[PDB]
Design a protein around this ligand. Structure first.
Ligand SMILES: *[C@@H]1O[C@H](CO)[C@@H](O)[C@H](O)[C@H]1NC(C)=O
Lengths: 49, 49
């Protein structure tokens, strides 16, 4: 019987997709608004972790 | 005839042929186990070949 060497590791690569919205960049902004001037931002069609 | 000569002719005759060996398992169900379990039903074609 012909033996076959088992694979040692696994390499996965996937084509990217819709760009990231960079929630951390907006959360780390230096212009902190007041509780009276609370800032609202909308986010859609993104991919966040 | 009054004058002659000697001519030569070549011919080839085949005697042997390349010996080909085929592995049934490595061709049909190389490494996977479910494939072998399903092929175990056809338990006569490989031995005949
Ligand atoms: C036969 O032919 C050869 C080659 O052409 C020549 O050398 C020879 O003299 C010839 N023989 C005769 C008897 O004519």
């Amino acid at each position: 019987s012909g033996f076959t060497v088992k694979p040692v590791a696994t390499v996965h690569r996937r084509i990217p997709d819709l760009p990231d919205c960079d929630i951390d960049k907006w959360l780390n902004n230096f212009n902190v608004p007041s509780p009276l001037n609370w800032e609202r931002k909308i986010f859609s069609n993104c991919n966040f972790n | 005839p009054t004058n002659f000569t000697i001519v030569g002719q070549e011919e080839f005759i085949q005697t042997n042929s390349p010996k080909v060996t085929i592995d049934c398992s490595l061709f049909v169900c190389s490494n996977y186990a479910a494939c072998h379990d399903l092929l175990s039903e056809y338990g006569t074609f490989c031995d005949n070949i």
